[PDB]
Design a protein around this ligand. Structure first.
Ligand SMILES: Cn1cc(-c2ccc3occ(-c4cccc(Oc5ccccc5)c4)c3n2)cn1
Length: 325
């Protein structure tokens, strides 16, 4: 098991000495190491489970990282830098520059207190610029979520001093000309064209970013569900009814009666959705214009039609970012 090879004091690749576990995910774990062959630099090493699905994603991630890091050697667009990779007792291990805490861990460890709006603005801008760089290079991330946005530095007292981020986890990233998996994204961040199996591309990341920004603002998801039908019902309650053209195209005709979701609003699930969800703008905590600007951007990211949906190039110009400029 991975447990036998990921302990503090263990030495990987004859140079990386584990000093701590940073986090875990479905894929394995990430550990902080001292690199004895780079003057004691601390690095992060992602130790990948020895399971086909995850080995395959790691191999994919290595190839995407080699491309992105070569294309952007200064990390101007804030994708994490891969230093090397190796195998250890049959596990793929990817070595990265050491970043700080995930945005998820930060919010969680603060009891789900939301980020300050000023920090949201800076973070949102950087996420948009980073993912736009993927988009420019015929890539879609597909698995954006707060866990995959990390702070660059440990620049906090937790109270944040500088909110600079990088994007991680390129194990699901897909090239335009590549086989597109049927199911992508973590459910709460998954776009409607994904759910409805309508085909997806870069716009599905923009949907995911909208969902991230809501979460940073509120401390919680507006899609608190583990079911696809209920997810769609929540969308309807927050954003209005889905477009006819999307309903008519879906092979998932089951879900709809005459271009309305086949959903009993008076059932237990129906009552739950009516309580937890409401029109997007009603979640605003202030009527101040900077909050209205954020919510206007989020509404455009959560456009149902992936063609009409704002692009990240466009998002970077939105009025919400004017305080940075
Ligand atoms: C998924 N992934 C994570 C990395 C990566 C690359 C460089 C890093 O420098 C510090 C961390 C790190 C800091 C706190 C928690 C943490 O654990 C995680 C983070 C995300 C998903 C699950 C576990 C990792 C770190 N993580 C690359 N791919």
């Amino acid at each position: 098991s991975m447990h036998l090879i990921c302990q503090s004091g263990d030495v990987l690749s004859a140079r990386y000495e584990i000093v701590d576990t940073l986090g875990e995910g479905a894929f394995g774990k990430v550990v902080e190491c001292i690199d004895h062959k780079a003057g004691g630099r601390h690095v992060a090493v992602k130790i990948v489970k020895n399971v086909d699905r995850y080995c395959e994603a790691a191999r994919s991630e290595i190839q995407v990282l080699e491309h992105l890091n070569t294309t952007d050697p200064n990390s101007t667009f804030r994708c994490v830098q891969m230093l090397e990779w190796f195998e250890h007792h049959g596990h793929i291990c990817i070595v990265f520059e050491l970043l700080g805490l995930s945005t998820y861990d930060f919010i969680k460890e603060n009891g789900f207190l939301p980020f300050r709006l000023d920090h949201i603005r800076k973070m949102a801008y950087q996420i948009c610029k980073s993912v736009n760089f993927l988009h420019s290079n015929k890539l879609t991330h597909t698995d954006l979520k707060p866990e995959n946005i990390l702070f660059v530095q440990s620049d906090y007292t937790r109270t944040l001093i500088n909110p600079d981020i990088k994007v991680v986890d390129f194990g699901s990233a897909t090239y335009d000309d590549e086989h597109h998996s049927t199911l992508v994204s973590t459910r709460h961040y998954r776009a409607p064209e994904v759910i409805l199996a309508l085909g997806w591309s870069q716009p599905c990341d923009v949907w995911s970013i909208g969902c991230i920004l809501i979460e940073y603002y509120l401390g919680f998801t507006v899609f608190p569900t583990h079911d696809s039908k209920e997810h769609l019902a929540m969308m309807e309650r927050i954003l209005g009814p889905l477009p006819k053209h999307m309903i008519q195209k879906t092979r998932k005709r089951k879900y709809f009666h005459h271009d309305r979701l086949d959903w009993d609003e008076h059932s237990s699930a129906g009552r739950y959705v009516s309580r937890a969800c409401k029109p997007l703008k009603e979640f605003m905590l202030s009527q101040d214009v900077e909050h209205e600007r954020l919510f206007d951007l989020i509404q455009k990211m959560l456009e149902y039609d992936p063609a009409k949906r704002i692009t990240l190039r466009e998002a970077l110009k939105h009025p919400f970012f004017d305080l940075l400029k």
